[PDB]
Amino acid sequence: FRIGRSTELQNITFDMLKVFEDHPTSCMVNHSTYYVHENKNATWCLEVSVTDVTLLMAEHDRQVLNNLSNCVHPAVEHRSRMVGLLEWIFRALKYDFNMDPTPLCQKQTSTVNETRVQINITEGFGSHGFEDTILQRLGVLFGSRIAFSNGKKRFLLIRNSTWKNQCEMNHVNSMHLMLANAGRSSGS
Amino acid sequence: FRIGRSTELQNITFDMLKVFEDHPTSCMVNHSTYYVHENKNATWCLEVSVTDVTLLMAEHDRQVLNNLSNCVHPAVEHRSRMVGLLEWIFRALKYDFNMDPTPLCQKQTSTVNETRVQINITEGFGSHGFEDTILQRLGVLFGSRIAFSNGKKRFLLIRNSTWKNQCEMNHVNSMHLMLANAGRSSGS
Amino acid sequence: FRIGRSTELQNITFDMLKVFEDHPTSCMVNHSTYYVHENKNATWCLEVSVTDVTLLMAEHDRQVLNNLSNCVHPAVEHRSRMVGLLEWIFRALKYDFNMDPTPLCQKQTSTVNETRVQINITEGFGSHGFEDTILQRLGVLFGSRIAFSNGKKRFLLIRNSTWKNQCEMNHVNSMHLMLANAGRSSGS
Amino acid sequence: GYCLERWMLVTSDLKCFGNTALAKCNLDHDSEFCDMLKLFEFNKKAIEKVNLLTHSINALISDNLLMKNRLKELLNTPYCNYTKFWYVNHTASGEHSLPRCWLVRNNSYLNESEFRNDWIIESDHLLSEMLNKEYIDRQGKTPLTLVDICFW
Amino acid sequence: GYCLERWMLVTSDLKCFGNTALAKCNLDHDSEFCDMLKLFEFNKKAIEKVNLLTHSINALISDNLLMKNRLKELLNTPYCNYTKFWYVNHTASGEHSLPRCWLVRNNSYLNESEFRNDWIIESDHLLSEMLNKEYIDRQGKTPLTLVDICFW
Amino acid sequence: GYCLERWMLVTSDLKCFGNTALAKCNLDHDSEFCDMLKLFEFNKKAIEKVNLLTHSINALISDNLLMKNRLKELLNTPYCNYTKFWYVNHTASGEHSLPRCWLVRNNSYLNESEFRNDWIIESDHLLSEMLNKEYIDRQGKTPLTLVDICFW
Ligand SMILES: *[C@@H]1O[C@H](CO)[C@@H](O[C@@H]2O[C@H](CO)[C@@H](O[C@@H]3O[C@H](CO[C@H]4O[C@H](CO)[C@@H](O)[C@H](O)[C@@H]4O)[C@@H](O)[C@H](O[C@H]4O[C@H](CO)[C@@H](O)[C@H](O)[C@@H]4O)[C@@H]3O)[C@H](O)[C@H]2NC(C)=O)[C@H](O)[C@H]1NC(C)=O
Ligand SMILES: *[C@@H]1O[C@H](CO)[C@@H](O[C@@H]2O[C@H](CO)[C@@H](O[C@@H]3O[C@H](CO[C@H]4O[C@H](CO)[C@@H](O)[C@H](O)[C@@H]4O)[C@@H](O)[C@H](O[C@H]4O[C@H](CO)[C@@H](O)[C@H](O)[C@@H]4O)[C@@H]3O)[C@H](O)[C@H]2NC(C)=O)[C@H](O)[C@H]1NC(C)=O
Ligand SMILES: *[C@@H]1O[C@H](CO)[C@@H](O[C@@H]2O[C@H](CO)[C@@H](O[C@@H]3O[C@H](CO[C@H]4O[C@H](CO)[C@@H](O)[C@H](O)[C@@H]4O)[C@@H](O)[C@H](O[C@H]4O[C@H](CO)[C@@H](O)[C@H](O)[C@@H]4O)[C@@H]3O)[C@H](O)[C@H]2NC(C)=O)[C@H](O)[C@H]1NC(C)=O
Ligand SMILES: *[C@@H]1O[C@H](CO)[C@@H](O[C@@H]2O[C@H](CO)[C@@H](O[C@@H]3O[C@H](CO[C@H]4O[C@H](CO)[C@@H](O)[C@H](O)[C@@H]4O)[C@@H](O)[C@H](O[C@H]4O[C@H](CO)[C@@H](O)[C@H](O)[C@@H]4O)[C@@H]3O)[C@H](O)[C@H]2NC(C)=O)[C@H](O)[C@H]1NC(C)=O
Ligand SMILES: *[C@@H]1O[C@H](CO)[C@@H](O[C@@H]2O[C@H](CO)[C@@H](O[C@@H]3O[C@H](CO[C@H]4O[C@H](CO)[C@@H](O)[C@H](O)[C@@H]4O)[C@@H](O)[C@H](O[C@H]4O[C@H](CO)[C@@H](O)[C@H](O)[C@@H]4O)[C@@H]3O)[C@H](O)[C@H]2NC(C)=O)[C@H](O)[C@H]1NC(C)=O
Ligand SMILES: *[C@@H]1O[C@H](CO)[C@@H](O[C@@H]2O[C@H](CO)[C@@H](O[C@@H]3O[C@H](CO[C@H]4O[C@H](CO)[C@@H](O)[C@H](O)[C@@H]4O)[C@@H](O)[C@H](O[C@H]4O[C@H](CO)[C@@H](O)[C@H](O)[C@@H]4O)[C@@H]3O)[C@H](O)[C@H]2NC(C)=O)[C@H](O)[C@H]1NC(C)=O
Ligand SMILES: *[C@@H]1O[C@H](CO)[C@@H](O[C@@H]2O[C@H](CO)[C@@H](O[C@@H]3O[C@H](CO)[C@@H](O)[C@H](O)[C@@H]3O)[C@H](O)[C@H]2NC(C)=O)[C@H](O)[C@H]1NC(C)=O
Ligand SMILES: *[C@@H]1O[C@H](CO)[C@@H](O[C@@H]2O[C@H](CO)[C@@H](O[C@@H]3O[C@H](CO)[C@@H](O)[C@H](O)[C@@H]3O)[C@H](O)[C@H]2NC(C)=O)[C@H](O)[C@H]1NC(C)=O
Ligand SMILES: *[C@@H]1O[C@H](CO)[C@@H](O[C@@H]2O[C@H](CO)[C@@H](O[C@@H]3O[C@H](CO)[C@@H](O)[C@H](O)[C@@H]3O)[C@H](O)[C@H]2NC(C)=O)[C@H](O)[C@H]1NC(C)=O
Ligand SMILES: *[C@@H]1O[C@H](CO)[C@@H](O[C@@H]2O[C@H](CO)[C@@H](O)[C@H](O)[C@H]2NC(C)=O)[C@H](O)[C@H]1NC(C)=O
Ligand SMILES: *[C@@H]1O[C@H](CO)[C@@H](O[C@@H]2O[C@H](CO)[C@@H](O)[C@H](O)[C@H]2NC(C)=O)[C@H](O)[C@H]1NC(C)=O
Ligand SMILES: *[C@@H]1O[C@H](CO)[C@@H](O[C@@H]2O[C@H](CO)[C@@H](O)[C@H](O)[C@H]2NC(C)=O)[C@H](O)[C@H]1NC(C)=O
Ligand SMILES: *[C@@H]1O[C@H](CO)[C@@H](O)[C@H](O)[C@H]1NC(C)=O
Ligand SMILES: *[C@@H]1O[C@H](CO)[C@@H](O)[C@H](O)[C@H]1NC(C)=O
Ligand SMILES: *[C@@H]1O[C@H](CO)[C@@H](O)[C@H](O)[C@H]1NC(C)=O
Ligand SMILES: *[C@@H]1O[C@H](CO)[C@@H](O)[C@H](O)[C@H]1NC(C)=O
Ligand SMILES: *[C@@H]1O[C@H](CO)[C@@H](O)[C@H](O)[C@H]1NC(C)=O
Ligand SMILES: [Zn+2]
């Protein structure tokens, strides 16, 4: 691009792969579905979804009360990394376990082979504006416009899954995730 | 105002109403009595006071243990907004429910039509300097000189009341309140 | 020092004693042993050590669950200051009592005259990277290179002791300690 | 430059600040006026529905400057309460300084004499700036080679 | 000046930016390019084992600038997504401006005309800068007393 | 300029730093010396009873600069330990640069040669600054119109 007879408009594009290969990243499939990935070579991931379907019940499932680690089965080989990444996500949400609604996770004898963590974001369950806080935090973390949309039941659900390259990693999302988790060790 | 033969001193005064109409604000009646207003048109408010009178007792009243929302009666129409504003206040105090003294709130069968939250700031009840921390936080939040004054019983009491234009709103107080509550949704 | 025929290299050394006489400070004996001191004239202190032998057991000792102040005997004259300094240390470590492993402190009927607080940093007890997080936080706080060293049992132990001038005062360590504890009252 | 809306101020008049004075906002971190301008600009662009003020309040309002002013207020020291700002205006030319906070003591605005030394030098500086931009403006257009030719 | 390794960029070419342009990084707080340079320098000096990126991510990346760009993205406003940066280069001399972020709308890079005023005037500044450093360079070497003697 | 108290230093001598050198503190964010000056000023004005140092420690001490220096210390890289600061002083005139931190390696102060390039060029800048303020001072007083008349 030639601005004038002695001036040219030039550009450079960065490659942020080696900076963020070994750190947690995230990406958006659509405005309701997000994926968090421990590092590039991890064969598993955690998807975060805004749902209108009640998947866990207080009468059948476990309350997360300072025991989030119990929500992952002891036989999972990446159990420690899974619990870590769950904590990374909870810090990224600015979640306050003292005042925010108590999350639910699946019963210990669940037949389904995935870890569910359910936060009730239905209006009136938490304080006024708690659901808007969660949706706007999702927009900050993943670039979601779900907060900018039109009182039924909603839930923020984090479930584990196998990594199938569902979405391409976003290094801006990586910077948001790491900034919300300053001081927590990462990178191998 | 004239400085020299070719220059003048002049000023502008800002109007901060439209910026802070829809957000929580606060006001100082005197150095011991404070009001937090959820927004300009709200007919209720939360009074925060430094008292020497024991109003709630551990033997008769409930202690706040991850259930602050239970301290507001379910029949209150603005219950969700009141619980939210209480959380805004606790978050503006930099309160740590893990290490700070457990707050008390009124019993379920209380005859008085007030939601009362009591924090014991008597010397020796918490760690050394906890009461000074609370009073200096009150000074930062509301402009209080109570910390800069002359070991009896003291309490920080947050009760609910009807808005009666007890003060005039302060946008510096609003700025402090919002800065302590960054990311929490507000404004309607 | 003479840089040239008309210039010189000059230096000034600061004396930060009077700035930090009345505030908590910390020292490194070696890469595993650190001491936190309330102020210059305090006759007690708290040492923080990375140890390889368990001192407290879940079967015999007390879990720290919103009751850290119970870990100091009521008869201690500096009990309130000791509990405060323990909270200052826990804030300096960026400890999250909701998601981090529950600390242990000694039983009520303990024969030893020490207040022990034990955090299990053995690999697998917490989430992945928790021990590295703690060791790197120790490096940030005291200048320790223990994180930069070569899966046996490991613990972070805070015990109380008498100040015997174990180190020299370090004002960089004081600055880190105060930055992690912004807003908490100190200085007498 | 940037023109303040009528609802922003209380004087019921149009106040436009030139870009020359407002260019100092980016470098300065102790200017409460620039924080107020950022807040007003964010609110204006939001008005013209989800309120995002809590997400950007850190980026618009400096917490350290607000803390410093509050601590000055608690110690009965002159402080900024983010309401009134003074600036020096060259009436003949229209050039003006970046507005500075009008300090407050005992719930009363500081009198003009009590910060006279503040608005004297500023005025002087303004004049000096008006005598320093002219040299830079000419130097921007004419290269050094042309001046060298005139010497010989 | 400082230059970027082959793995840093995607153009498979060597890119050295002079210290004159990079000197504006310390004063500016709205430059995403300087934040990217700080990240890349930290990563490079770490590569040449404990990763300390989470300890210094605040020091390298401005949370306020990232938050502002994210909020612009959420409002369907042009924003920086920290990938492509444009700069004005004086080809004959090699002097160049500090690179600025190439904005994005609708998941598409902003077209050159859509921010023409950003790089027209910027280009002008470059030329003016190249005509202002010459005066300062001469003024740095020759004292004012020598000029006074020439007058008399 | 601002002059340090006897108890602030360990040399048992009076050290006054001019306002010209200290004016760079506001723009700079990597100067540990300016952070030390802010701490000392806050302490002095507090001494001349509630201590408010924990409320303003963030405003006086940059956590990012401290974290960067600590991380350099942990990696066995030269770092600032906030104790000794060096500056270049023009003995004949008394003008001086803003003091910069004397780095430390292996619990030992860095030798003068190991950062010679830091204080060679710095010294040069001082002289250049002493030859650049004179031009600006004259330009501040005399307008451009007077110079134009002399040309014709
Ligand atoms: C994290 O940790 C929390 C606690 O800190 C766990 O929550 C507890 O989970 C246990 C085990 O499932 C629950 O115990 C069961 O509760 C029921 C009775 O509890 C009464 O009291 C609680 C007060 O805590 C009330 O909420 C509840 O309504 C009841 O009034 C029964 O369903 C169960 O009875 C079973 O055991 C008894 C004897 O042991 C048998 O006779 C019964 O037939 C039956 O088998 C059982 O006692 C406990 O209630 C939960 N507490 C709370 C507060 O919710 C979380 O599960 C844990 N999370 C993870 C992920 O580990
Ligand atoms: C997402 O998260 C979920 C939930 O946390 C994970 O699902 C768990 O996966 C583990 C393995 O990683 C499962 O554990 C395995 O289950 C099998 C046996 O289960 C039966 O166990 C007894 C047998 O009668 C009964 O209760 C019942 O029939 C159960 O179905 C076996 O495959 C494994 O046992 C074998 O290996 C272990 C360890 O090597 C040995 O001790 C055993 O002897 C045996 O050789 C193992 O126990 C676990 O059940 C799953 N949890 C749930 C809740 O279903 C997902 O793996 C995870 N996904 C990703 C991608 O991360
Ligand atoms: C937030 O949540 C907390 C708990 O998480 C609530 O605090 C509990 O409140 C309940 C209901 O008032 C209390 O239960 C009552 O406690 C007494 C006996 O409790 C023993 O154990 C507790 C340990 O938890 C000790 O503190 C206490 O000293 C006792 O040793 C009795 O007063 C009550 O007995 C009543 O019920 C029984 C049968 O149900 C009857 O026989 C009796 O006659 C009587 O009616 C009752 O059990 C409980 O103790 C509280 N726990 C704690 C830890 O304080 C908060 O109230 C809640 N806050 C809000 C705002 O909702
Ligand atoms: C500050 O906070 C306090 C405490 O949280 C609030 O006070 C509560 O106010 C609510 C209403 O907002 C009160 O609830 C109402 O009480 C009345 C009935 O109370 C009696 O209930 C039975 C009847 O025998 C007995 O236990 C006893 O006699 C009680 O006195 C009625 O006015 C209301 O009932 C009517 O409305 C509801 C809902 O519409 C219907 O379900 C009922 O059938 C009926 O039509 C209602 O229940 C509550 O009691 C108060 N709490 C306390 C602790 O006293 C303040 O309102 C709040 N103030 C502000 C300004 O925010
Ligand atoms: C901070 O607060 C926590 C609780 O909030 C305290 O932890 C409790 O400590 C008490 C003792 O101080 C423990 O009580 C003892 O526990 C055993 C039985 O507990 C059952 O249930 C708990 C669930 O809470 C399980 O962990 C446990 O395995 C058991 O299934 C027994 O050892 C004791 O019995 C004693 O009393 C009974 C009657 O009172 C007698 O018959 C017995 O002979 C014996 O004397 C006792 O009940 C309690 O379990 C602890 N809770 C938890 C969750 O760990 C911390 O100690 C406290 N910390 C500080 C520093 O104060
Ligand atoms: C580090 O932290 C530890 C643990 O918190 C502290 O050790 C405690 O120190 C206190 C004193 O500060 C000890 O309390 C004293 O113990 C003695 C009596 O203990 C016996 O008590 C009965 C008597 O039969 C039995 O249980 C048993 O035999 C005990 O050994 C006495 O010296 C004291 O009592 C006297 O003073 C009190 C108050 O003045 C009076 O009420 C009494 O009547 C009597 O006159 C006192 O009770 C406590 O036991 C220690 N804790 C532990 C766990 O051992 C360290 O002091 C602390 N160190 C530093 C440097 O800070
Ligand atoms: C998540 O939170 C929501 C919001 O509180 C919960 O849904 C609500 O559940 C309550 C009962 O717990 C429902 O109240 C009932 O409604 C009807 C009359 O409207 C009737 O069955 C009863 O008299 C009672 O009042 C309430 O309607 C319902 N709200 C909505 C919007 O559906 C939900 O249970 C929570 N889910 C989990 C998994 O935690
Ligand atoms: C708020 O905290 C204060 C401070 O701890 C509590 O007051 C204190 O209560 C204790 C008992 O719980 C009092 O101790 C008693 O004092 C006398 C002798 O001095 C005697 O009755 C007993 O032997 C016992 O030692 C203590 O004096 C008292 N302190 C003060 C300053 O009054 C208070 O109970 C707490 N209130 C609430 C509502 O939580
Ligand atoms: C601190 O945390 C560590 C790490 O989890 C705990 O040590 C671990 O303790 C478990 C039992 O609770 C040990 O598992 C046992 O190991 C052998 C076979 O390897 C056998 O005895 C049992 O079948 C069982 O699997 C585990 O080996 C052990 N890990 C290490 C590295 O020693 C420790 O108990 C915790 N300590 C405290 C005081 O909390
Ligand atoms: C900043 O301080 C000034 C006074 O120094 C305040 O202006 C006064 O406001 C009250 C209402 O609270 C009026 O009754 C007075 O007439 C005003 N005085 C003057 C001299 O104008 C102003 O409100 C303060 N602003 C804040 C945010 O505290
Ligand atoms: C920044 O935005 C640009 C487009 O404006 C993105 O570049 C696109 O990347 C996708 C893959 O995600 C490619 O398929 C497209 O071909 C690219 N488009 C162009 C025009 O180059 C870029 O990935 C974005 N970066 C981030 C971090 O979000
Ligand atoms: C900064 O580092 C210097 C050395 O590089 C420290 O000065 C030494 O202090 C010890 C006491 O700890 C004295 O015994 C030495 O004689 C000093 N050495 C020199 C060369 O002066 C200084 O204490 C350090 N400051 C901090 C805050 O760590
Ligand atoms: C402040 O000024 C007011 C108004 O004159 C006066 O009443 C008061 O005593 C002064 N001092 C203090 C400390 O408030
Ligand atoms: C953005 O541009 C795309 C591509 O042309 C178009 O499909 C879309 O409608 C535009 N608007 C929005 C709000 O996404
Ligand atoms: C972008 O602008 C150029 C001219 O600079 C024009 O040729 C081109 O068509 C434009 N692209 C689009 C997609 O409008
Ligand atoms: C640092 O220098 C000291 C003093 O000479 C020396 O003993 C030590 O080996 C050096 N290296 C390290 C890594 O400490
Ligand atoms: C430090 O450098 C000086 C010259 O500037 C030299 O004389 C001296 O020996 C050096 N010191 C060490 C310890 O190498
Ligand atoms: Zn800055």
* Interior angle at CA F67, CA F64 and CA F69, nearest 5: 110
| Vertex A159: Cα angle to A157 and A165 (nearest 5) | 115
**Residues contacting ligand 12 via CB (< 6 Å):** C 168, 170-172; F 81-83, 104, 107-109
- The DSSP bridge partners found for residue E9 are A14
Interchain proximity F55–C183, CB inside 8 Å: yes
User: Any residues with CB less than 8 A from the CB of E116 and at least 6 apart, and which?
Assistant: none
Q: In chain B, at which residue ranges do the beta strands (DSSP E only) sit?
A: 2-4, 7-13, 25-30, 33-37, 44-51, 62-63, 104-105, 116-120, 155-162
DSSP-based three-state secondary structure for D85: strand
Residue nearest ligand 16's atom 8 by CA: F106
Contacts of E69 in chain A (CB under 8 A): 172
**What is the distance in angstroms between the Cα of F64 and the nearest Cα belonging to chain E?**
5
∠ Cα D84 D89 D90 (to 5°): 175
Q: Are strands F84-89 and F100-101 parallel, antiparallel or unpaired?
A: antiparallel
Query: Which of D55, A139, A32 has its CA nearest to residue B185?
Result: D55
Contact B179 D63 (CB under 8 A): yes
Mutate-to-test residue for ligand 16 from F73, F103, F106, F109, highest number of ligand atoms within 8 A of CB: F106
Show the beta-strand stretches assigned E in E23-122.
Answer: 84-89, 100-101, 104-105, 108-109
- Residue A6 forms part of a structural domain: yes
Pocket of ligand 2 (CB under 6 A): A 44, 72-73, 75-76, 110, 113-115, 160, 162
Confirm if E9 and A12 have CB atoms less than 8 A apart: yes
Q: Hey, what are A77's tokens?
A: 């080989």
Any ligand 6 atom below 6 A from CB of C160: yes
**Which of C99, C130, C132, C179 should one mutate to test binding to chain A, selecting the residue with the greatest count of A CBs within 10 A?**
C99
Spatial distance between the Cα atoms of C110 and C106, rounded to a whole number of angstroms: 7
Residue C1 lies in a domain: no
Q: How many domains does chain D have?
A: 1
Residue B11 lies in a domain: no
Burial of C87 (0-12, 13-18, 19+ CB in 10 A): buried
Contact C119/C156 with Cβ under 8 angstroms? yes
The rounded distance, in Å, linking the Cα atoms of A153 and C26 is: 51
Say if residues E96 and D106 touch (Cβ distance below 8 Å).
no
Residues of D in contact with B94 (CB under 8 A): none
Q: Which of D27, D141, D143 sits opposite E134 (nearest CB)?
A: D143
- DSSP 8-state secondary structure symbol assigned to residue A180: T
Q: Is C170 helix (H, G, I), strand (E, B) or coil?
A: strand
* SS3 of residue C125 by DSSP: coil
For residue D56, the SS3 value is helix
**Count of CB atoms within 10 A of residue D58's CB?**
16
Distance CA C33, CA C50 (A): 7
Contact D41, D1 (CB under 8 A): no
With contact defined as beta carbons under 8 Å apart, do F29 and E62 qualify?
A: no
In this complex, the residue of E11, E91, E126 whose CB is nearest that of residue A13 is: E11
- What is d(CA E144, CA C29) in angstroms, rounded to the nearest whole number? 58
Contacts of A129 in chain B (CB under 8 A): 84, 184-186
With contact defined as beta carbons under 8 Å apart, do C58 and C104 qualify?
yes
Closest to E96 (Cα-Cα) out of E18, E5, E42: E18
Chains D, E: CB pairs < 8 Å: 36
List the structure tokens of F36.
């030390």
Sheet holding A44-51, edge to edge: A25-30, A33-37, A44-51, A155-162, A116-120, A104-105, A62-63
**How far, in whole angstroms, is CA F5 from its chain's centroid?**
16
Structural biology method used: cryo-EM
* Number of compact structural domains in chain C: 1
For residue D126, give its domain range: 2-151
One-letter amino acid identity for B106?
Answer: Q
Q: How far is the CA of F114 from the centre of ligand 17 (A)?
A: 9
Question: Is B1 contained in some domain?
Answer: no
Resolution in angstrom units: 2.4
Please give the backbone phi and psi of residue F41, each rounded to the nearest 5 degrees, phi first.
-65, -45
Chain B CB contacts of C84 below 8 Å? 127-130
Token pair 């502002």 is at which residue?
E68
The beta strands (E) that lie in chain F are given as 3-4, 15-16, 84-89, 100-101, 104-105, 108-109
- Which residue intervals of F2-115 are DSSP H helices? 19-22, 32-47, 53-60, 63-74
b/e E11-43 (16+ beta carbons within 10 angstroms → b) = eeeebebeeebbeeeeeeeebbbbbbbbbbebb
Helices (H), chain A: 17-20, 79-92, 130-142, 171-179
Q: Both tokens of residue B186?
A: 């507000």
For residue B68, the 8-state DSSP code is: G
* Alpha-carbon radius of gyration of chain C: 19
Encoded tokens for B97: 């429910």
Residue A25 in any domain: the answer is: yes
CA angle B43, B44, B49 (to 5 degrees): 145
Contact F50 B147 (CB under 8 A): yes
Token readout for C31 is 């890469």
DSSP state of B66: S
* CB of B153 less than 8 A from some CB of A: no
Q: Would B95 be classed as within a structural domain? A: yes
Contact of B23 with D53, CB cutoff 8 Å:
yes
Q: Chains with ≥3 Cβ pairs under 8 A against F?
A: B, C, D, E
Interface of C with E in 108-147 (CB under 8 A): 132, 136, 140, 147
Those residues whose C-beta lies under 8 Å from the C-beta of residue B77, and which sit 6 or more positions away, are none
| Domain enclosing residue B38, as ranges | 16-179
Q: Which residue has the tokens 């009595």?
A: B33
DSSP three-state, residue F25: helix
> Which residue of D51, D135, D144 is the best one to mutate when testing the E interface, meaning the one whose CB has the most E CBs within 10 A?
D144
Distance of CA E91 to the CA centre of its chain: 17
Cα D83 from Cα D103, distance rounded (Å): 9
Q: How far apart are CA F115 and CA F113, in angstroms?
A: 5
CB distance A160 to A46 below 8 Å: yes
**Ligand 1: which residue has its CA nearest to atom 13?**
A62
Instruction: Tell me if B9 sits within 8 A of B2, measured CB to CB.
Output: yes
Output phi, psi for C112, to 5 deg: -65, 145
d(CA A124, CA A121): 8
* C12 domain-assigned: no
C122 at the A interface (CB within 8 A)?
no
Distance from C-alpha of E81 to C-alpha of E72, rounded to nearest angstrom? 10
B95 touches chain C (CB under 8 A): no
- The candidate with the shortest Cα–Cα distance to B181, out of B86, B98, B117, is B86
Across the interface, of A66, A86, A186, the residue whose CB is closest to C98 is A66
| Contact indicator for C70, C21 with CB cutoff of 8 Å | no
Would you say E90 and D74 are in contact if contact means Cβ atoms under 8 Å apart?
no
Reported residue count of chain B is 188
Asked if the structure places residue C99 within a domain, the reply is yes
**Cβ-proximal residues to D111 (8 Å cutoff; 6+ apart), any chain:** none
| C-alpha of B138 from chain center | 8
Contact A84 C129 (CB under 8 A): yes
Specify the ligand 17 atom closest to the Cα of F112: 5
| Residue B163, ligand 8, Cβ within 6 A | no
The SS3 of residue A27 is: strand
Residue F40 DSSP symbol: H
The neighbour count for residue B157, using CB atoms within 10 Å, is 20
Residue indicated by tokens 């002399």? F150
From chain C, the residues in CB contact with B128 under 8 A are 80-81, 83-84
